[PDB]
């Protein structure tokens with residue numbers, strides 16, 4: 001399986017660098033084809049580039065490519081596996097459980113949707129506190145997705161001033177800061193350095209364990225007041241899954257694994273949604289024509305009176321296109337999360353041995369030159385036909401694809417749709433640095449893009 005010849009100890013780092021590694025992968029694909037080999041120091045990585053290879057692996061050999069693969073830093077920073085990093089029956093069975101409970105009406109009288117709607121009108125209330133004055137939305141937008149997960153795991157959101165909530169928030173955001181430092185790919189190239197610089201990974205381990213404790217005291221309060229035959233949140237359903245398993249007791253569901261699945265949901269369920277929303281508003285500032293068009297659909301379909309809901313989305317194609325086009329443009333997980341093969345397998349006639357790490361290039365699919373003609377340009381017509389109707393694409397994979405597809409695809413769709421429409425129904429976004437100037441080009445470091453810093457005022461309508 002071809003690829004550039006790597007140097008003695010520094011792997012392929014001269015060829016890919018430490019900057020925008022997804023761009024380097026596209027360039028390498030131009031010379032080695034859609035299936036190349038790449039060395040992260042001494043570790044052999046198969047990269048899959050265009051749609052055809054990604055679809056052929058993740059969908060057609062779905063089981064064979066179902067494995068999760070772990071780079072050095074994550075290996076050291078993770079004590080205990082839940083869902084994101086699990087493999088085999090542990091992953092198969094917890095993931096299955098989690099999707100069950102993440103369905104709209106999958107645990108109690110309260111739906112996921114009602115959770116997201118409650119959050120939407122609190123999000124709006126807090127933005128109303130900003131008194132139409134310049135503000136960095138990073139924090140407020142960060143709280144809403146975290147709080148949806150709080151409500152899903154604990155039945156009950158927290159006021160945004162609740163100190164339980166701010167600690168969990170502080171702990172989650174610090175993990176995102178540590179993890180966005182450019183010299184994180186330096187660890188994956190030279191893992192020896194983890195020992196010589198353990199600051200990173202010790203801070204991750206300390207933060208996770210803080211969160212694990214907090215959750216533990218939560219599942220205790222649950223074990224106490226828990227009504228079987230009447231589960232109301234994630235913890236309840238897990239606790240009672242433990243009872244239906246307490247007999248045949250090898251057993252994948254335990255207090256350890258619930259803590260682990262819980263921290264994952266918080267980590268996987270906060271950062272990406274938060275950034276997508278922050279980036280959405282940035283783009284809505286830059287392109288006010290687009291914003292004006294979304295507001296016409298809101299006044300027409302939903303009033304100014306009631307609150308949005310999911311049934312409204314089928315009747316709002318432009319807004320569905322904007323949401324779709326934010327996710328595709330911004331390409332927040334350029335190489336999703338590293339995959340790994342389940343056994344020795346010939347792929348496009350190449351032979352790839354069991355447990356070999358795979359990087360899926362989601363960028364190559366999301367920014368396919370042909371499906372999306374100006375792919376590095378923000379344009380909702382990418383998902384509209386000549387009438388105003390919504391136009392699906394099989395190249396829309398920001399949640400990846402196949403057997404490891406984001407467990408929260410639906411939830412994220414609800415959050416994005418309901419928080420964005422809720423914000424634009426209630427406010428007009430005013431820029432302070434004038435649309436024309438401000439730059440919306442992703443700041444990329446390794447496998448993580450983020451918008452540049454901006455401010456805006458939320459002026460009520």
Ligand code: HEC
Nearest residue numbers: 083084268269272273276336337399400404406407408412
């Ligand atoms: C449930 C809360 C939750 C929310 C909200 C959420 N995710 Fe996820 N996402 C997950 C979990 C859990 C996984 C792990 C799946 C697995 O390993 O089997 C995941 C995995 C992924 C992967 C894994 C890639 C792969 O092939 O293995 C990508 C890409 C991803 N998410 C993107 C997103 C994007 C983009 C958003 C929103 C803009 C988002 N997720 C919002 C829970 C969430």
